[PDB]
Amino acid sequence: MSAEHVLTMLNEHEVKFVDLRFTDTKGKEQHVTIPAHQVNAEFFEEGKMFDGSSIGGWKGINESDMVLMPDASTAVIDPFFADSTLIIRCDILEPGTLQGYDRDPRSIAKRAEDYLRSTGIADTVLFGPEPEFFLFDDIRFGSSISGSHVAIDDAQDIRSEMCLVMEQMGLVVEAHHHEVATAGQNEVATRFNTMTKKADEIQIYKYVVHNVAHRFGKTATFMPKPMFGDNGSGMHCHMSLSKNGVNLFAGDKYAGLSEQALYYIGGVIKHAKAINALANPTTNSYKRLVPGYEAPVMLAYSARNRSASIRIPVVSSPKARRIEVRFPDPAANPYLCFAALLMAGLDGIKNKIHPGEAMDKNLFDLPPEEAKEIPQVAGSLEEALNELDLDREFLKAGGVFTDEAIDAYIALRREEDDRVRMTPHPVEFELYYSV
Amino acid sequence: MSAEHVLTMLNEHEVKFVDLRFTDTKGKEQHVTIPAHQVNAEFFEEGKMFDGSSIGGWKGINESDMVLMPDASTAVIDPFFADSTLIIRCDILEPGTLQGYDRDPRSIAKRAEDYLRSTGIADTVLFGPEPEFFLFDDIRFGSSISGSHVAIDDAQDIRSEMCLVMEQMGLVVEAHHHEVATAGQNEVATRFNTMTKKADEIQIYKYVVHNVAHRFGKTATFMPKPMFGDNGSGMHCHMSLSKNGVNLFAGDKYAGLSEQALYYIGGVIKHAKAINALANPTTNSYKRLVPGYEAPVMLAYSARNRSASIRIPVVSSPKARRIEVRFPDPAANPYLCFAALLMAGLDGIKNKIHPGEAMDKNLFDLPPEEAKEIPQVAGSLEEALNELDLDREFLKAGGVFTDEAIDAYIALRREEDDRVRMTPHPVEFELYYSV
Amino acid sequence: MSAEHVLTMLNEHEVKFVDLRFTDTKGKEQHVTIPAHQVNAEFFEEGKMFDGSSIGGWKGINESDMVLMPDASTAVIDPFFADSTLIIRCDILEPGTLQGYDRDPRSIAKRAEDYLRSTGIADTVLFGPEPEFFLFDDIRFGSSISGSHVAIDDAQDIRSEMCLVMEQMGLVVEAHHHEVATAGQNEVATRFNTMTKKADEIQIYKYVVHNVAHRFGKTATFMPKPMFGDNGSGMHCHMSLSKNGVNLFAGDKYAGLSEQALYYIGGVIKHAKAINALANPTTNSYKRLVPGYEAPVMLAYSARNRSASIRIPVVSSPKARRIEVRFPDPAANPYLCFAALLMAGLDGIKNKIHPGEAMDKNLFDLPPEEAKEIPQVAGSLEEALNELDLDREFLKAGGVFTDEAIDAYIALRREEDDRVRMTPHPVEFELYYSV
């Protein structure tokens, strides 16, 4: 899809504004809106000059502006704006070299896919995530010097019209279930795409969910554990690799899974804590990866066991043979999370890393003199960030991740880890106020 | 002081009730009240049969009762009860052997002192703690399934009458300062005693503080960090060793400190994380031992530096030469905390452990490529409990701590660590709800 | 009715979503919604992969997914959804064998009918239930640690539009009476169908009632005893058996009733407590089956007496000769309740079980030295579940009910029986608080 069709779309829909959207390293979606008449043919080869100081982690105060280069293939009409707006996802480029910024999540995802095609291991990667969210009637939260509080006050109509708006915005939806047990927990499923396209679709997904909830007077959250005791919000990721239109994950070994796939799982298992730094980036994220019950915490693979973090779904077709990793959560930055998973898998394939043996077991149900034995995902955000700091190498292969970018990411996550670490918690008053 | 004087006190003061008090492994103070006429001469050689199942960590459901044996030297009139009551601190004894219970904090403290006298290193130990508390006007806290909250609403009269009641109850008070900067933070200082006597005095201290506050319509808390940004509540512990009436900590080395004292500091530094499991037993306790600013976090000794955890106070007298360790907090169980510090020091003396060199530096003010280098106290309650689980040996010397007692303590602290770990925190809503 | 007509209906009505509905062992109605464009011709021969772990009683955590196979003959447009939806009832199938799941109520009902046709006793069974509900203006209920409460605040328009919506959804309605005496108690009658069709109609009935009430700002309940003193909600079930288009219940004996029918009644009477475990599955259900007054509690048959649980309605036609059992309540799972009644009747026919003599008496009005003598329905849910545990055999004939399925059902009902048993009741405070 080219720029000419975008200008045609501008004239056709009577678009008044164009909303250029990009993503911070935090995963938050930033935007700049320009009038539709400022979009010309030339606009698609110079982009828009932006002040790259405001965003955290990015260019500092002395190193100056960046370039917003739109991707014309990502153009879509915004359903929620009163004045007809066209959304275009943009890359952040260095104004001189006019190349992808080192600290740009979208550029990093594109680099990861390019490295995939470069290494010759496969031609494309298919990512299918399953982001789950919570719908609440109301919420009030706050934290002053003299205490803290949160209060959460808990339909088909909301989800069905979410699905309709998501299909307006180019997503292909394929199920809309409520979770049977958990109050407010909903999940819309969607069709698999390539990494960067699917990450863009995850940004559109979250946008639609948030805005459609506000229309119905609700509040949606993609926060991995918003409520005690009730099951957390996850984002299970199905990976496949394809070369010239055939799966590399289809073979003859355990559950019809290929040798290349087994090394992919090995690579994911080995670096899973460095991955956890990117896939599980919040401190809330480790209240659902808790040691013990109902946790996708055990770093092993099994088609039967559902206490293993890595599942091998059973499909009556060699053309759909994938691995599902279940530890990532919807608070992840889709670009960085997906790039991390792909690079871990490629490092596993490159180094012939063998995952071991399938745990057709009942984990959790194992006595805790063997619960200790199995590799586990990171126990806290500090542990994950430390493991990332020590295990940078697999992310730097092919220059996808810069040392500088990893450093900036770690620092930006630590400034939030520390704020959580040093605020007093209400449960600590219940337990220790009298003591 | 004998039983006969206690019966004399019963007749003299017209005591109606006798309150037998003991301490859980949590540090909470349990009591059984008997009528004054049930106290006979025979009562001081059989004690009182107690059901030892209710308390957590102690004897289970199949192993049955314990014995409350009063210590007649700990008798004191309760100032707060309308019906004249005599408080007596009791030990928990096994009904058969009539020996100190293995999971009894007071018995463990007595065993630690007995082992001290057995090893011949010194004759007695002098402990001077400095417990600090917070006075608030009001507080409301709570944690349901649908959220959590805390709200804290912030005088000379209260402290001065606290000091008067503490001197009624046999404490020798020696200062009553308000903390200049921190709202509500107060501190009453007291004279040094031996380990077990001082631990009993710390229990009386906390009792008096709590009850006198309630009289004035206030709420006192010994919780290490009840409020954000404002400095935490600590309990700095001054240790001295004496043999036949002379300090073993008085010598000719750094700041007039003896060789035996240097090995004591070495032993405290080496095992400081295993100690932290007992001296810093709450998860709140590590919000004041935070990496960085104003933390007694650096495991080194210095007479000048006040970022070192271990201080060497300067006194114009060889008869008062002590080491002050500043990481313990007032939520500690005084018996277990003091026993741990003494045993670490004795293991340091026994194994000739050299602490190294005095850090006449400015810590925190050090660049964080050397902040990393220095030994640190435990970063979280999990780390401290794991280090305790691995470093049991120094506590088991002379059979002071049983493996069974250490196991029960660790399990009982973990069941609270886990409850804190899996509840959602209000600050995590502020940071990640939208994300 | 085939799949082709369903795809035609999708195009005709401009259906946007398809709602696949199934029933737990609890009787609760679960659903998965897919977009209308995901329904293809192939979708009706593979179904939809579902995670069968969430539902209680069904496949555990290690045994993995199930298949939703739609029944194209059960397709109907949902009247309450804003986005035009097509409801299809689905069976749960094992993904391998592609056969009916053992713990699936709908599959069990189909198996019961298949066993009926297999044994050659009859060709089809006609079930006519009479589910009654309560309409309230408002209700508030709750149960915390510090008490419990319920408060119920009590038209032709509601029922008449209920009847209209039920006829939209393929039910044939045939009366809409309010109960003369009981506040809020309403009843819509419907035409007889076969077992599985009628159970599907009972699910549609309950759905329509609940949703139409919410439209009018009311609350409907199918709970057997929502209010003290006032008569409970029942679901009287009329059974008939047909072979090649003639009743087997039409004959020459008592009230024109056939020999086969008499053994059917005998079989129902013998196993009525095992049946009560399925037809009366709640603890509330035995507050309307109370020993004494106005209870369909007496296990005997009579055309005249209305204190007998089994009635023989008088009809001026041999083509309508049925037996009405009056103990079942609308909280029952229609599939399991109906399967249980049919299997008890078939075991009665197979074993020539004679019911005895008609009780043309006045029961309740009998002195309680003969009230004791007559067989009674179960007195509590525990008794019913114990009798079911002992009397499994009649349900296992022809493999309709698995031992595993019965075990799972019993366990799932017991976890609710126990929660009711151990919560303190307000009336027990009225009677025994002072005592």
Residue numbers in the entry:
A (entry chain A), B (entry chain A), C (entry chain A): 1 to 154, 189 to 469
Quote the passages of the study that discuss this structure, keeping the authors' original sentences.
To investigate the performance of the microscope in practical biological structure determination, we chose eleven macromolecular specimens with different sizes and symmetries to show that the capabilities of the instrument span the full range of molecular structures for which the single-particle cryoEM method is ideally suited. We determined eleven structures, with three having four identical molecular subunits, three having twelve identical subunits, and one structure each having 1, 5, 6, 24, and 60 subunits. When compared to the range of atomic structures determined by cryoEM in the PDB in recent years, we can therefore conclude that the system overall works well for nearly all specimens amenable to single-particle cryoEM. It is notable that all the structures were obtained with a single day of data collection where the number of one megapixel images in each case was between 350 and 500, equivalent to 20-30 images from the current generation of 16-megapixel direct electron detectors in use at 300 keV. The resolutions were all sufficient to build accurate atomic models (2.6–4.5 Å), and a majority of the structures (7 of 11) extended to beyond physical Nyquist resolution, indicating the power and importance of combined detector and optical performance.
Two of the others were essentially at Nyquist resolution (catalase and glutamine synthetase at 3.4 Å), with only PaaZ and the 70S ribosome at 0.9 Nyquist.
